[PDB]
């Protein structure tokens, strides 16, 4: 495929201005077997040239270009190649080009994807075009700053539904096909054009008119999955977003209708094609899941909806602004979740999941500025981008930020814009100087630590208060400007819980900033210098506040300050400032009202329990790890047993046990729940919980390959196959690890997700000794894997098999010795990242036994 460079795109954009595409797709052969390889694609493009007589090109990736006709002249396409496209010599002022080609389906979710379903034989298609794979379906100037209208017409097998960006009309052809004529779209970038086609099950709803017109809504999924799709709940959350964004952005939904389609083998998660959003099928839940998965699905639904304005109505000029596109949609989705849905605690989720991913990534040796240069198409973090964007909102002011956004949307509608265009609208709205701001926040790496320096009188009121900021590390050590809030918490007189008794908001700059507003204010029991989680930083506490956190974290009433305390404790553990055994004690608590057992936010419970298992396996001193896991598994069994029957908390406690190093008593209890002899009342032991408990029994030698085979026969599905592959990898024998290693490293015929699933069961915290010999085999065999497989398939093998299990200096020495060699750069990067994790675990283990 072509590697369109930025300069090439700029040259073409200076020259051309595209009015309209008329696309005709002949998919009548699309319902056959695996051999069907191509479909008919006719494109008519009307565009203008600013220099008559000039030359330019148009992109297309097809097997055969049958006909190309520019302004009525037949072009020579005998020498056509996918990488070169079609040359357009001797351009006129106004041009019309007609191309007839044969484009091919894909098995990679690049371009037009084709997939066939076993349950019923159904054949399902969908487009994935971001970044520049629109050219695999139609002839186009495939770059985001040459917007055009599209009129799409598809002839399809008569039982297929067809969905596109715009609404359409269907006509029976009398030849076993139907013809789908879609309205001309509003102007949009090529990467946002959509086609979804197959025997999809359909549900319909409508969002009523609110200056915003009525919006027709649809939801589509594979026929085989329709029984599991909770369409009513998806439509409620969809309607909640459309009532929110118009008011927040001041601009009504820009397109006519809104379809959301769940599609098979989706690599991308979700994709904001205008009026036709595509979703990964993991968002259709076949088993009982906790409320956190529903929340995360709602966030992604609103993420893609926000892109209808930011991304689709106004689009980046070039892909170096991809970060901003995603970052904004992340912020806007959480804004909408809190403002419009049942997920009112969604900033707690952002602080605990998104921010903690941002920090971890920022502190890697691979760290880079949020706004990287993108010179080409293969040159194409977001967590940090989202985090930094939230701080940009705080610094500008929310009210000013939204006011600037309406200005931006109005000014650039149906057109393109850059980061600088946004920053200018936000400067005009706020009075701030954002030139300085980007240089400090978007072109730098690393984190500042923020902590209070305080003094109190006899009555407990502040006599002085400042915020201390450390240099940005890893990076250039600059001090940033932060708009933050300082929160003071103290006992509630009616309940005894810790509640907020003061907040002040202020600009923090430099190494130290005094807060005169706090002089005379009672210091309470807990001071948070990043209260409301406004800025991106490493927050630290004064001595008394840290003691209160350790003693009474479960007592904090509001979920966001409580989550910020869980985050602080965790990031202190990662950084070797809090002992891994002290994090574990804090999490496990001593009573029904302390520690994570008293945490009401189910997303926090799951995340904190995961981090605790990281602290035990990776950060606890090896001499103490057996006792730590004895404490963890016993506390979790007691929490699962005490939990309310059928509740999310009960399920989360059982799921955490399934990932743990377990003693006999836990194994016996778990066997009883799986086979029914001694069930946990209320616990729904459905298909995916069965796999979870079976995998745990397998990992501890309590179930053999017979039982894996038995569970696979009761769950003969693609998902079941993957969970069965993980279980076979988990078998704690040298023979099973050798087979799994060989299959993951050397079998390229196996499908991608099956290779993924094999690797996912290679590691287990109770099997460290079994895997010792694979530290050396990793570094001996990684170059061969990188050479043999493509980078997309090699990367998950390299990341997933890195021996993060072996926390030892010998592992660092083998990684060091490998780094001394000549290896591909991208591969050195991944080994560097894995090496850094082990270094960090060694420092934590050193601190823990101290
Ligand atoms: Zn996005």
TrEMBL record:
Ca(2+) binds at residue 130. The keyword Metal-binding applies. Residues 102-192 form the Aminopeptidase N-like N-terminal domain. Its EC number is 3.4.11.2. Residues 238-441 form the Peptidase M1 membrane alanine aminopeptidase domain. Its cofactor is Zn(2+). SUPFAM superfamilies: Leukotriene A4 hydrolase N-terminal domain, Metalloproteases ('zincins'), catalytic domain. It catalyses: Release of an N-terminal amino acid, Xaa-|-Yaa- from a peptide, amide or arylamide. Xaa is preferably Ala, but may be most amino acids including Pro (slow action). When a terminal hydrophobic residue is followed by a prolyl residue, the two may be released as an intact Xaa-Pro dipeptide. Residues 526-838 form the ERAP1-like C-terminal domain. Keywords: Aminopeptidase, Calcium, Hydrolase, Metal-binding, Metalloprotease, Protease, Zinc. Zn(2+) binds at residues 272, 303, 307, 326. It comes from the Bacteria. GO terms for biological process: peptide catabolic process; proteolysis. GO terms for molecular function: alanyl aminopeptidase activity; metalloaminopeptidase activity; peptide binding; zinc ion binding. GO terms for cellular component: cytoplasm; extracellular space; membrane. Belongs to the peptidase M1 family. This is Aminopeptidase N. It comes from Saccharopolyspora erythraea (strain ATCC 11635 / DSM 40517 / JCM 4748 / NBRC 13426 / NCIMB 8594 / NRRL 2338).
């Amino acid at each position: 495929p072509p590697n369109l460079t930025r300069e090439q795109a700029e040259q073409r954009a200076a020259l051309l201005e595209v009015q309209s595409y008329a696309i005709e797709l002949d998919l009548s052969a699309g319902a056959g077997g695996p051999e069907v390889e191509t479909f008919g694609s006719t494109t008519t493009v009307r565009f203008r040239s600013a220099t008559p007589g000039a030359e330019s090109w148009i992109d297309l990736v097809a097997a055969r270009v049958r006909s190309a006709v520019l302004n009525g002249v037949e072009l020579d396409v005998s020498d056509y190649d996918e990488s070169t496209g079609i040359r357009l010599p001797e351009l006129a002022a106004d041009n019309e080009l007609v191309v007839h080609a044969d484009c091919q389906y894909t098995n990679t979710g690049e371009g037009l994807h084709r997939f066939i379903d076993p349950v019923d034989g159904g054949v399902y298609l969908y487009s994935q075009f971001e970044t520049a794979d629109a050219k695999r379906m139609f002839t186009c100037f495939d770059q985001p700053d040459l917007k055009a209208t599209y009129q799409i017409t598809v002839t399809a097998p008569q039982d297929w539904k067809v969905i596109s960006n715009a609404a359409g009309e269907v006509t029976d052809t009398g030849e076993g096909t139907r013809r789908h004529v879609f309205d001309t779209t509003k102007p949009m970038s090529t990467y946002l054009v959509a086609l979804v086609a197959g025997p999809y099950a359909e549900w319909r709803d409508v969002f009523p008119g609110d200056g915003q017109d009525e919006i027709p809504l649809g939801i589509y999924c594979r026929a085989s999955l329709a029984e599991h799709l909770d369409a009513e709940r998806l439509f409620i959350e969809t309607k909640q977003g459309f009532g929110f964004f118009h008011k927040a952005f001041g601009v009504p939904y820009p397109f006519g209708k809104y379809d959301q389609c769940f599609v098979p083998e989706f690599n991308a998660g979700a994709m904001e094609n205008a009026g036709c959003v595509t979703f990964l099928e993991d968002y259709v839940f076949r088993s009982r899941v906790t409320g956190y998965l529903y929340e995360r699905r709602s966030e992604t639904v609103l993420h893609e909806m926000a892109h209808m304005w930011f991304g689709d109505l106004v689009t980046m000029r070039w892909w170096d602004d991809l970060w901003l596109n995603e970052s904004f949609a992340t912020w806007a989705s959480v804004l909408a979740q809190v403002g419009a849905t049942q997920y009112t605690n969604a900033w707690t989720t952002f602080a605990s999941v998104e921010k903690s991913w941002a920090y971890r990534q920022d502190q890697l040796p691979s760290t880079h500025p949020v706004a990287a240069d993108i010179p080409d198409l293969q040159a194409v973090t977001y967590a940090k981008g989202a985090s930094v964007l939230k701080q940009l909102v705080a610094y500008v002011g929310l009210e000013n930020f939204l006011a600037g956004l309406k200005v931006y949307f109005d000014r650039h509608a149906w057109g393109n814009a850059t980061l600088d265009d946004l920053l200018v609208a936000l400067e005009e709205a706020s009075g701030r100087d954002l030139s300085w701001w980007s240089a400090q926040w978007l072109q730098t790496t690393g984190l500042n630590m923020l902590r209070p320096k305080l003094a109190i009188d006899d009555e407990g009121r502040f006599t002085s208060f400042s915020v201390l900021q450390s240099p940005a590390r890893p990076g250039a050590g600059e001090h940033r400007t932060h708009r933050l809030a300082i929160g003071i918490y103290d006992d509630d007189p009616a309940t005894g819980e810790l509640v907020r008794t003061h907040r002040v908001e202020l600009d923090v700059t430099g190494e130290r900033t005094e807060v005169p507003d706090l002089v005379g204010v009672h210091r309470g029991k807990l001071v948070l210098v990043n209260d409301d989680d406004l800025t991106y930083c490493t927050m630290r506490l004064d001595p008394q506040s840290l003691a209160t956190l350790i003693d009474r974290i479960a007592d904090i009433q509001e979920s966001l300050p409580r989550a910020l305390c869980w985050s602080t404790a965790w990031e202190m553990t990662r950084e070797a400032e809090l002992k891994a055994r002290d994090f574990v004690s804090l999490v496990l608590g001593s009573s029904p009202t302390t520690g994570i057992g008293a945490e009401s936010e189910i997303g926090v419970v799951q995340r904190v329990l995961l981090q605790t298992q990281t602290a035990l396996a990776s950060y606890a001193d090896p001499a103490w790890q057996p006792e730590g896991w004895r404490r963890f598994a016993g506390r979790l069994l007691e929490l699962a047993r005490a939990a309310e029957p059928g509740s999310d908390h009960q399920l989360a406690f059982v799921n955490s046990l399934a990932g743990s190093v377990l003693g006999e008593e836990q194994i016996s209890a778990m066997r009883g729940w799986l086979d029914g002899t001694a069930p946990l009342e209320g616990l729904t032991v459905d298909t995916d919980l069965r796999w979870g408990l079976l995998q745990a029994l397998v990992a501890h030698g309590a179930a053999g390959e017979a039982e894996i085979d038995a569970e696979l026969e009761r769950d003969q599905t693609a998902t079941g196959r993957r969970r069965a592959e993980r279980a076979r990898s988990l078998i704690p024998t040298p023979e099973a690890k050798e087979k799994a290693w060989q299959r993951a490293v050397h079998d390229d015929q196996l499908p991608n997700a099956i290779s993924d699933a094999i690797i996912s069961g290679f590691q287990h915290p109770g099997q460290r000794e079994l895997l010792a010999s694979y530290v050396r085999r990793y570094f001996d065999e990684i170059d061969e894997v990188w050479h043999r497989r493509s980078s997309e398939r090699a990367q998950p093998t390299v990341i997933g098999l890195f021996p993060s299990w072996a926390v030892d200096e010998d592992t660092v020495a083998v990684a060091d010795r490998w780094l001394e060699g000549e290896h591909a750069p991208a591969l050195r990067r991944l080994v560097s990242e894995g090496r850094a994790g082990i270094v960090r675990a060694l420092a934590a283990r050193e601190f823990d036994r101290s």
